[PDB]
């Protein structure tokens, strides 16, 4: 219960929620892409590797999304997925459309 509630709170209280690990180039690239849209003020990154419950968090992220890997990216509670999914959405205009719908980009 506690782990799920905590993960939920991160996803529900931040429009952009990224679960990450330490020294991961795909975590870093995804966060950099998102900050490139000047999303900092509505973004929260959680390093779940520096956490005693990493495996529980990853298992719950798999329950929510189908994958246990980080980065795990949510936008207004919708699952974007990993960095590869973010790159596809970014290159194909879907990311910008999401952010426009949220008033985050004009």
Domains and CATH numbers, the chain: 1-102 (3.40.30.10)
**What CA–CA distance (Å, rounded) separates 80 from 89?**
8
For residues 43 and 18, is the Cβ–Cβ distance under 8 A? yes
Strand-pair partners of 37 = none
Continuous H helices in the chain: 2-13, 25-36, 54-65, 83-91, 94-101
- In the PDB record, what is the listed experimental method? X-ray
Q: What is the resolution of this structure in A?
A: 1.8
Give the residues after which the backbone of the chain is interrupted, taking a C-to-next-N distance over 2.5 angstroms as a break: none
Kind and range of the H or E run holding 45: strand 43-47
38 labeled binding residue: yes
For residues 77 and 48, is the Cβ–Cβ distance under 8 A? no
69-96 b/e (C-beta count within 10 Å ≥ 16 → b)? bbbbbbbbeebbbbbebbeebbeeeebe
49 labeled binding residue: yes
23 labeled binding residue: yes
């Amino acid at each position: 219960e506690a782990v799920k509630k905590w993960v939920n709170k991160i996803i529900e209280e931040n429009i952009i929620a990224v679960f990450a690990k330490t020294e991961c180039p795909y975590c870093i690239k995804a966060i950099s892409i998102l900050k490139g849209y000047n999303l900092n003020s509505h973004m929260h990154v959680e390093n779940i590797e520096k956490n005693p419950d990493m495996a529980n968090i990853q298992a719950y992220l798999k329950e929510l999304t189908g994958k246990s890997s980080v980065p795990r990216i949510f936008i207004n509670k919708d699952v974007v997925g990993g960095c590869d999914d973010l790159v596809k959405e970014n290159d194909e205009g879907k990311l910008k459309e999401r952010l426009q719908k949220l008033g985050l980009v004009n």
